[PDB]
Write a protein that binds this ligand. Structure first.
Ligand SMILES: Cc1n[nH]c2ccc(-c3cncc(OC[C@@H](N)Cc4c[nH]c5ccccc45)c3)cc12
Lengths: 20, 337
C-alpha cells in the first residue's frame, strides 16, 4: 500500500529545508 | 469587506516595514528552559521572561553559521517581516535583539505542538479536519500575498496548534517582500512547485501549490510526491502525475487538481479571480470564512494542556550552551537587525 511505502521510507521524520 | 480590511492591514504593515523595531530586549532578561527544535544555523528554546513570568519561544541564530550558509539577507527578511505583520494565524514576534555571537527572535510560545507530530501520530486527518486547517492557511496567504509577501515554506513542521485548536504559522526564514518574480531555490523538497525545481523565476503561486501539497498530506497521511532522496521527489513533481487515495471525495480531488497544477495559467490562486477561485470551490462550500478569521468555529482537536511551561507536545533535543564571544562577529552583515 502507499501508506506502507511511505512509512518504510526515510522521509517520515521532520524534513529539512533546502536552498542553493 | 475583504478589500477594505486588507487595505487597512497594508497601512499597518507598511509603517512597521519602513521603520523596523530593533533591540527591544536582552538575553539576561530570560531564563532558558529547554530546546524545542534545531536547524542548520539555529535553534529554538523555551524561555521564561523574568519580568512578566511569560513563556516564549526564543529563536537563536549563530551569525557565523548564517554567513556560511549564505542566509544573511533571508534572516534580515525574516525579522523585518515578522515585526511588521499582524494576523490571527501568524505567530507573533515579541522581541528581537543580538549580541556578539547571535541573533534572537522571541516569539509567542505555542505549547500544543506541531501539526507534523499530531498528523504522523494520528495518521491522517478527516476531510472536515483538514478543511478547517486549510481554511486558516487560505486566509493567511490571502493576507501575506496582499502585502507582497511570499512565504515559501508551508509544511506541517511549521504549523503549531494553539490552545483553541487553531493554527499558528512559524518560521519566516524564506519569507520575502517582492513585487514580481524571484529566483532563489529554497523551500522543502516535498513542497516545491515545479517552477522552483526547473529554476524559472516564480511568484506567490508557489505558495498555492504548497497548499495543495499540505491539503493532500493532511487528508492522505502522506505527501503526493515522496521518495527516499530529494532528486527522486523532484522527478515526481515535474512529471506531476498525482494519484489520489480512493477515500478522497470528488470535490477534494478537483480542488487538488487545480492547486497541484503545473500550468500557471490554470493554477488556482494565480488566476484573474485570485483567492476566490479557492474560497468559492465546492470543497469549501461549508466554510464560513468570517467565523474562521474570528475564531468562532469549534476546532476538531484541542491539544492536551499540562500547564504553562509544559513541553510534552514537543520532542526532546540535545541541549547545547549559548556561547557569547567577547568579540563582535559579523557586525556589518547584521547592522540593521
Ligand atoms: C515552539 C514554538 N512556539 N512558538 C514558536 C515560534 C516560532 C518557532 C520556529 C521559528 N523558526 C523556525 C522554526 O523551525 C521549525 C522547522 N522549520 C525547523 C527549523 C528550520 N530552521 C530552523 C532554525 C532554528 C530552529 C529551528 C529551525 C520554528 C517555534 C515556536
Amino acid at each position: 500500500t502507499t501508506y506502507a511505502d511511505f512509512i518504510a521510507s526515510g522521509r517520515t521524520g521532520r524534513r529539512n529545508a533546502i536552498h542553493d | 469587506s475583504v478589500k477594505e480590511f486588507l487595505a487597512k492591514a497594508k497601512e499597518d504593515f507598511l509603517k512597521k516595514w519602513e521603520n523596523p523595531a530593533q533591540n527591544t530586549a536582552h538575553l539576561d532578561q530570560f531564563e532558558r528552559i529547554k530546546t524545542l527544535g534545531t536547524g542548520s544555523f539555529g535553534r529554538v528554546m523555551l524561555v521564561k521572561h523574568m519580568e512578566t513570568g511569560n513563556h516564549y519561544a526564543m529563536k537563536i541564530l549563530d551569525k557565523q553559521k548564517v554567513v556560511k550558509l549564505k542566509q544573511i539577507e533571508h534572516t534580515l527578511n525574516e525579522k523585518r517581516i515578522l515585526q511588521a505583520v499582524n494576523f490571527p494565524f501568524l505567530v507573533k514576534l515579541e522581541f528581537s535583539f543580538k549580541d556578539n555571537s547571535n541573533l534572537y527572535m522571541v516569539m509567542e510560545y505555542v505549547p500544543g505542538g506541531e501539526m507534523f507530530s499530531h498528523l504522523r501520530r494520528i495518521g491522517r486527518f478527516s476531510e472536515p479536519h483538514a478543511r478547517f486547517y486549510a481554511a486558516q492557511i487560505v486566509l493567511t496567504f490571502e493576507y501575506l500575498h496582499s502585502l507582497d509577501l511570499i512565504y515559501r515554506d508551508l509544511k506541517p513542521e511549521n504549523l503549531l496548534i494553539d490552545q483553541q485548536g487553531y493554527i499558528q504559522v512559524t518560521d519566516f526564514g524564506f519569507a520575502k517582500r517582492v513585487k514580481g518574480r524571484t529566483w532563489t531555490l529554497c523551500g522543502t523538497p516535498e513542497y516545491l512547485a515545479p517552477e522552483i525545481i526547473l529554476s524559472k523565476g516564480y511568484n506567490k503561486a508557489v505558495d498555492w501549490w504548497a497548499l495543495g501539497v499540505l491539503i493532500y498530506e493532511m487528508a492522505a497521511g502522506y505527501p503526493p510526491f515522496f521518495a527516499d532522496q530529494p532528486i527522486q521527489i523532484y522527478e515526481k513533481i515535474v512529471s506531476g502525475k498525482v494519484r489520489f487515495p480512493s477515500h478522497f471525495s470528488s470535490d477534494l480531488k478537483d480542488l487538488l487538481r487545480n492547486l497541484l497544477q503545473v500550468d500557471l495559467t490554470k493554477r488556482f490562486g494565480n488566476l484573474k479571480n485570485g483567492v476566490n477561485d479557492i474560497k468559492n470551490h465546492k470543497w469549501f462550500a461549508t466554510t464560513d470564512w468570517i467565523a474562521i478569521y474570528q475564531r468562532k468555529v469549534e476546532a476538531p482537536f484541542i491539544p492536551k494542556f499540562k500547564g504553562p511551561g509544559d513541553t510534552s507536545n514537543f520532542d526532546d533535543y540535545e541541549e547545547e550552551e549559548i556561547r557569547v564571544s567577547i568579540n563582535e562577529k559579523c557586525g556589518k552583515e547584521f547592522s540593521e537587525f
